[PDB]
Tab-separated table of all heavy atoms in Angstrom:
chain	number	residue	atom	x	y	z
A	1	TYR	N	10.503	3.645	-12.698
A	1	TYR	CA	10.654	4.476	-11.474
A	1	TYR	C	9.424	4.338	-10.568
A	1	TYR	O	9.570	4.495	-9.341
A	1	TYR	CB	10.908	5.939	-11.847
A	1	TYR	CG	12.327	6.250	-12.247
A	1	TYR	CD1	12.602	7.098	-13.307
A	1	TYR	CD2	13.399	5.699	-11.565
A	1	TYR	CE1	13.903	7.389	-13.681
A	1	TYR	CE2	14.707	5.981	-11.925
A	1	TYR	CZ	14.961	6.830	-12.987
A	1	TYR	OH	16.245	7.114	-13.348
A	2	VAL	N	8.251	4.074	-11.151
A	2	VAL	CA	7.004	3.989	-10.333
A	2	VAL	C	6.697	2.526	-10.002
A	2	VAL	O	5.840	2.298	-9.126
A	2	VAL	CB	5.811	4.719	-10.982
A	2	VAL	CG1	5.201	3.922	-12.120
A	2	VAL	CG2	4.748	5.083	-9.956
A	3	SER	N	7.371	1.570	-10.658
A	3	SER	CA	7.176	0.176	-10.291
A	3	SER	C	8.120	-0.244	-9.174
A	3	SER	O	7.748	-1.067	-8.323
A	3	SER	CB	7.358	-0.717	-11.507
A	3	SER	OG	7.614	-2.041	-11.097
A	4	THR	N	9.331	0.313	-9.138
A	4	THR	CA	10.231	-0.035	-8.043
A	4	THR	C	9.696	0.455	-6.706
A	4	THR	O	9.734	-0.275	-5.712
A	4	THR	CB	11.628	0.518	-8.294
A	4	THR	OG1	12.433	0.295	-7.134
A	4	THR	CG2	11.582	1.997	-8.589
A	5	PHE	N	9.179	1.683	-6.662
A	5	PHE	CA	8.571	2.194	-5.439
A	5	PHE	C	7.324	1.412	-5.064
A	5	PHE	O	7.018	1.266	-3.876
A	5	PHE	CB	8.243	3.672	-5.607
A	5	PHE	CG	7.166	4.156	-4.700
A	5	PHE	CD1	7.398	4.312	-3.355
A	5	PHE	CD2	5.922	4.470	-5.200
A	5	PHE	CE1	6.406	4.764	-2.525
A	5	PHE	CE2	4.930	4.922	-4.376
A	5	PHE	CZ	5.169	5.070	-3.036
A	6	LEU	N	6.590	0.914	-6.054
A	6	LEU	CA	5.468	0.031	-5.769
A	6	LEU	C	5.925	-1.202	-5.004
A	6	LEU	O	5.405	-1.509	-3.921
A	6	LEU	CB	4.782	-0.381	-7.064
A	6	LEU	CG	3.908	-1.604	-6.862
A	6	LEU	CD1	2.634	-1.171	-6.206
A	6	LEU	CD2	3.648	-2.291	-8.177
A	7	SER	N	6.889	-1.939	-5.560
A	7	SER	CA	7.343	-3.134	-4.857
A	7	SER	C	7.980	-2.777	-3.526
A	7	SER	O	7.912	-3.559	-2.571
A	7	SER	CB	8.315	-3.939	-5.701
A	7	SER	OG	8.727	-5.083	-4.974
A	8	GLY	N	8.563	-1.592	-3.423
A	8	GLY	CA	9.035	-1.128	-2.138
A	8	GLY	C	7.922	-1.063	-1.114
A	8	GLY	O	7.933	-1.807	-0.132
A	9	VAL	N	6.934	-0.199	-1.352
A	9	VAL	CA	5.871	-0.018	-0.375
A	9	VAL	C	5.105	-1.303	-0.143
A	9	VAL	O	4.390	-1.421	0.850
A	9	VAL	CB	4.898	1.097	-0.795
A	9	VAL	CG1	3.891	0.561	-1.767
A	9	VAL	CG2	4.202	1.669	0.413
A	10	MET	N	5.220	-2.275	-1.036
A	10	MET	CA	4.645	-3.573	-0.720
A	10	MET	C	5.599	-4.453	0.076
A	10	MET	O	5.165	-5.451	0.659
A	10	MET	CB	4.211	-4.295	-2.001
A	10	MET	CG	3.469	-5.589	-1.745
A	10	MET	SD	2.842	-6.436	-3.195
A	10	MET	CE	2.268	-7.941	-2.414
A	11	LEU	N	6.882	-4.104	0.137
A	11	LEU	CA	7.813	-4.931	0.895
A	11	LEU	C	7.558	-4.896	2.396
A	11	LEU	O	8.082	-5.749	3.113
A	11	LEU	CB	9.246	-4.499	0.588
A	11	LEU	CG	10.421	-5.335	1.084
A	11	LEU	CD1	10.149	-6.816	0.928
A	11	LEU	CD2	11.670	-4.943	0.320
A	12	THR	N	6.775	-3.934	2.900
A	12	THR	CA	6.639	-3.800	4.380
A	12	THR	C	5.205	-4.030	4.876
A	12	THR	O	4.818	-3.342	5.840
A	12	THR	CB	7.142	-2.429	4.848
A	12	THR	OG1	6.309	-1.431	4.256
A	12	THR	CG2	8.588	-2.171	4.485
A	13	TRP	N	4.464	-4.980	4.298
A	13	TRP	CA	3.103	-5.289	4.821
A	13	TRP	C	3.187	-6.068	6.139
A	13	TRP	O	3.908	-7.078	6.191
A	13	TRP	CB	2.238	-5.994	3.770
A	13	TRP	CG	1.708	-5.079	2.709
A	13	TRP	CD1	2.438	-4.299	1.861
A	13	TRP	CD2	0.327	-4.837	2.382
A	13	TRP	NE1	1.612	-3.592	1.029
A	13	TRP	CE2	0.310	-3.903	1.325
A	13	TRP	CE3	-0.891	-5.317	2.875
A	13	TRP	CZ2	-0.876	-3.443	0.756
A	13	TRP	CZ3	-2.063	-4.863	2.310
A	13	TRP	CH2	-2.053	-3.939	1.266
A	14	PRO	N	2.490	-5.634	7.212
A	14	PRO	CA	2.556	-6.293	8.519
A	14	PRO	C	1.656	-7.522	8.633
A	14	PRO	O	0.917	-7.681	9.607
A	14	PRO	CB	2.113	-5.183	9.472
A	14	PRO	CG	1.148	-4.402	8.666
A	14	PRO	CD	1.653	-4.426	7.251
A	15	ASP	N	1.708	-8.390	7.624
A	15	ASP	CA	1.074	-9.715	7.636
A	15	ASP	C	-0.269	-9.724	8.362
A	15	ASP	O	-0.558	-10.591	9.186
A	15	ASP	CB	2.015	-10.752	8.240
A	15	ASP	CG	1.704	-12.163	7.773
A	15	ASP	OD1	0.574	-12.641	7.999
A	15	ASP	OD2	2.592	-12.800	7.170
A	16	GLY	N	-1.103	-8.742	8.055
A	16	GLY	CA	-2.408	-8.688	8.679
A	16	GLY	C	-3.399	-9.619	8.012
A	16	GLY	O	-3.083	-10.779	7.735
A	17	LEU	N	-4.611	-9.126	7.768
A	17	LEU	CA	-5.588	-9.821	6.942
A	17	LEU	C	-5.657	-9.250	5.535
A	17	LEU	O	-5.883	-9.994	4.569
A	17	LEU	CB	-6.972	-9.756	7.590
A	17	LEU	CG	-7.390	-10.975	8.412
A	17	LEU	CD1	-7.591	-12.172	7.510
A	17	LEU	CD2	-6.356	-11.282	9.471
A	18	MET	N	-5.452	-7.940	5.405
A	18	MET	CA	-5.417	-7.323	4.088
A	18	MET	C	-4.410	-8.020	3.190
A	18	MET	O	-4.645	-8.191	1.987
A	18	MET	CB	-5.083	-5.844	4.226
A	18	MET	CG	-6.015	-5.112	5.158
A	18	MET	SD	-7.740	-5.283	4.683
A	18	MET	CE	-8.318	-6.447	5.915
A	19	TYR	N	-3.285	-8.443	3.757
A	19	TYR	CA	-2.313	-9.185	2.972
A	19	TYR	C	-2.917	-10.476	2.445
A	19	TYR	O	-2.793	-10.801	1.259
A	19	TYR	CB	-1.076	-9.474	3.806
A	19	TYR	CG	0.146	-9.623	2.961
A	19	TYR	CD1	0.619	-8.560	2.221
A	19	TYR	CD2	0.820	-10.827	2.886
A	19	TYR	CE1	1.734	-8.684	1.439
A	19	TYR	CE2	1.937	-10.963	2.104
A	19	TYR	CZ	2.390	-9.886	1.383
A	19	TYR	OH	3.505	-10.004	0.596
A	20	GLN	N	-3.586	-11.229	3.313
A	20	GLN	CA	-4.183	-12.472	2.856
A	20	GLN	C	-5.376	-12.245	1.946
A	20	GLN	O	-5.913	-13.217	1.409
A	20	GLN	CB	-4.589	-13.328	4.049
A	20	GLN	CG	-3.422	-13.729	4.921
A	20	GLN	CD	-2.247	-14.223	4.113
A	20	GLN	OE1	-2.233	-15.360	3.653
A	20	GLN	NE2	-1.251	-13.368	3.935
A	21	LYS	N	-5.811	-11.003	1.760
A	21	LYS	CA	-6.850	-10.738	0.774
A	21	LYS	C	-6.329	-10.121	-0.515
A	21	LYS	O	-7.073	-10.062	-1.496
A	21	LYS	CB	-7.928	-9.828	1.367
A	21	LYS	CG	-9.019	-10.586	2.100
A	21	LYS	CD	-10.009	-9.644	2.757
A	21	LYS	CE	-11.028	-10.412	3.576
A	21	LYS	NZ	-11.833	-9.513	4.441
A	22	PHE	N	-5.083	-9.649	-0.536
A	22	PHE	CA	-4.506	-9.023	-1.722
A	22	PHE	C	-3.433	-9.854	-2.407
A	22	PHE	O	-3.146	-9.624	-3.593
A	22	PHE	CB	-3.896	-7.672	-1.342
A	22	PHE	CG	-3.714	-6.749	-2.486
A	22	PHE	CD1	-4.733	-5.918	-2.879
A	22	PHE	CD2	-2.518	-6.690	-3.154
A	22	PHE	CE1	-4.569	-5.056	-3.929
A	22	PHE	CE2	-2.350	-5.828	-4.203
A	22	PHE	CZ	-3.379	-5.010	-4.591
A	23	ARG	N	-2.840	-10.803	-1.690
A	23	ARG	CA	-1.656	-11.487	-2.185
A	23	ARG	C	-1.931	-12.234	-3.483
A	23	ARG	O	-1.113	-12.204	-4.412
A	23	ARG	CB	-1.147	-12.437	-1.110
A	23	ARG	CG	-0.128	-13.419	-1.580
A	23	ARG	CD	0.533	-14.053	-0.394
A	23	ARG	NE	1.430	-15.124	-0.789
A	23	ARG	CZ	1.019	-16.337	-1.125
A	23	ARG	NH1	-0.274	-16.619	-1.116
A	23	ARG	NH2	1.898	-17.266	-1.467
A	24	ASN	N	-3.062	-12.933	-3.565
A	24	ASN	CA	-3.312	-13.775	-4.729
A	24	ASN	C	-3.453	-12.937	-5.993
A	24	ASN	O	-2.851	-13.249	-7.031
A	24	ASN	CB	-4.554	-14.631	-4.501
A	24	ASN	CG	-4.399	-15.573	-3.329
A	24	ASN	OD1	-3.796	-16.634	-3.449
A	24	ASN	ND2	-4.948	-15.191	-2.188
A	25	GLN	N	-4.251	-11.869	-5.922
A	25	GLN	CA	-4.363	-10.952	-7.047
A	25	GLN	C	-2.996	-10.439	-7.464
A	25	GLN	O	-2.656	-10.432	-8.655
A	25	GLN	CB	-5.266	-9.779	-6.686
A	25	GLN	CG	-6.740	-10.021	-6.836
A	25	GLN	CD	-7.545	-8.794	-6.452
A	25	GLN	OE1	-8.566	-8.888	-5.774
A	25	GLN	NE2	-7.082	-7.632	-6.882
A	26	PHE	N	-2.187	-10.006	-6.493
A	26	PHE	CA	-0.913	-9.407	-6.875
A	26	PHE	C	-0.004	-10.416	-7.557
A	26	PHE	O	0.634	-10.099	-8.565
A	26	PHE	CB	-0.195	-8.811	-5.677
A	26	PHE	CG	1.156	-8.276	-6.015
A	26	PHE	CD1	1.289	-7.047	-6.615
A	26	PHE	CD2	2.289	-9.017	-5.763
A	26	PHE	CE1	2.526	-6.559	-6.938
A	26	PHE	CE2	3.528	-8.530	-6.085
A	26	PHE	CZ	3.646	-7.301	-6.674
A	27	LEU	N	0.082	-11.633	-7.021
A	27	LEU	CA	1.001	-12.602	-7.609
A	27	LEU	C	0.550	-13.024	-9.001
A	27	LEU	O	1.377	-13.157	-9.915
A	27	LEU	CB	1.152	-13.813	-6.698
A	27	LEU	CG	1.828	-13.490	-5.373
A	27	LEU	CD1	2.367	-14.747	-4.740
A	27	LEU	CD2	2.928	-12.487	-5.568
A	28	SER	N	-0.754	-13.231	-9.191
A	28	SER	CA	-1.237	-13.546	-10.529
A	28	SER	C	-0.882	-12.438	-11.509
A	28	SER	O	-0.392	-12.703	-12.616
A	28	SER	CB	-2.743	-13.775	-10.510
A	28	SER	OG	-3.221	-13.999	-11.823
A	29	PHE	N	-1.121	-11.182	-11.120
A	29	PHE	CA	-0.831	-10.086	-12.037
A	29	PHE	C	0.650	-10.005	-12.354
A	29	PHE	O	1.034	-9.664	-13.476
A	29	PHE	CB	-1.294	-8.755	-11.471
A	29	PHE	CG	-0.724	-7.584	-12.195
A	29	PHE	CD1	-1.203	-7.233	-13.433
A	29	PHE	CD2	0.305	-6.854	-11.655
A	29	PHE	CE1	-0.680	-6.168	-14.110
A	29	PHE	CE2	0.831	-5.784	-12.329
A	29	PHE	CZ	0.336	-5.440	-13.558
A	30	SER	N	1.503	-10.281	-11.369
A	30	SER	CA	2.932	-10.272	-11.645
A	30	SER	C	3.291	-11.344	-12.656
A	30	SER	O	4.069	-11.094	-13.588
A	30	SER	CB	3.727	-10.469	-10.362
A	30	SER	OG	5.068	-10.073	-10.552
A	31	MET	N	2.725	-12.540	-12.498
A	31	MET	CA	3.003	-13.610	-13.452
A	31	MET	C	2.591	-13.205	-14.862
A	31	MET	O	3.341	-13.395	-15.828
A	31	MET	CB	2.286	-14.889	-13.025
A	31	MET	CG	2.670	-16.103	-13.841
A	31	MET	SD	1.787	-17.596	-13.357
A	31	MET	CE	1.663	-17.344	-11.597
A	32	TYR	N	1.419	-12.591	-14.991
A	32	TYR	CA	0.923	-12.255	-16.322
A	32	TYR	C	1.712	-11.104	-16.952
A	32	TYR	O	1.962	-11.106	-18.166
A	32	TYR	CB	-0.564	-11.930	-16.240
A	32	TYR	CG	-1.134	-11.305	-17.475
A	32	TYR	CD1	-1.800	-12.069	-18.410
A	32	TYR	CD2	-1.020	-9.950	-17.699
A	32	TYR	CE1	-2.325	-11.500	-19.536
A	32	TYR	CE2	-1.526	-9.384	-18.812
A	32	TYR	CZ	-2.186	-10.150	-19.729
A	32	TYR	OH	-2.704	-9.554	-20.853
A	33	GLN	N	2.085	-10.092	-16.163
A	33	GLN	CA	2.891	-9.004	-16.713
A	33	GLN	C	4.254	-9.512	-17.153
A	33	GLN	O	4.760	-9.131	-18.219
A	33	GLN	CB	3.045	-7.883	-15.687
A	33	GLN	CG	3.698	-6.628	-16.233
A	33	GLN	CD	2.805	-5.873	-17.197
A	33	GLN	OE1	1.660	-6.254	-17.429
A	33	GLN	NE2	3.325	-4.796	-17.763
A	34	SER	N	4.861	-10.381	-16.350
A	34	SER	CA	6.075	-11.036	-16.799
A	34	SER	C	5.846	-11.795	-18.098
A	34	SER	O	6.733	-11.836	-18.951
A	34	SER	CB	6.576	-11.976	-15.716
A	34	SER	OG	5.503	-12.743	-15.215
A	35	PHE	N	4.665	-12.393	-18.269
A	35	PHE	CA	4.353	-13.088	-19.520
A	35	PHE	C	4.384	-12.138	-20.710
A	35	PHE	O	4.969	-12.448	-21.758
A	35	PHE	CB	2.983	-13.760	-19.409
A	35	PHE	CG	2.386	-14.177	-20.730
A	35	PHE	CD1	2.556	-15.467	-21.204
A	35	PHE	CD2	1.630	-13.288	-21.482
A	35	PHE	CE1	1.999	-15.856	-22.405
A	35	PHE	CE2	1.081	-13.670	-22.682
A	35	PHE	CZ	1.260	-14.954	-23.144
């Protein structure tokens, strides 16, 4: 219930600079949690 809302609130990032500073960390962590 708290992970779906997480991916929700991440679905609407306005492609600023914060996105280009957070994306790599987030994708790596997703890969590892899936692992």
Side-chain angles (χ1 to χ4, degrees):
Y1 280 139
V2 77
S3 160
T4 173
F5 157 72
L6 162 78
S7 180
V9 82
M10 186 176 173
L11 189 41
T12 63
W13 284 59
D15 204 301
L17 263 292
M18 305 304 105
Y19 207 64
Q20 298 314 281
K21 273 176 185 169
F22 200 87
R23 167 166 174 282
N24 298 279
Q25 277 180 223
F26 176 79
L27 294 199
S28 176
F29 166 75
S30 197
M31 188 182 325
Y32 168 98
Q33 188 71 3
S34 46
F35 164 95

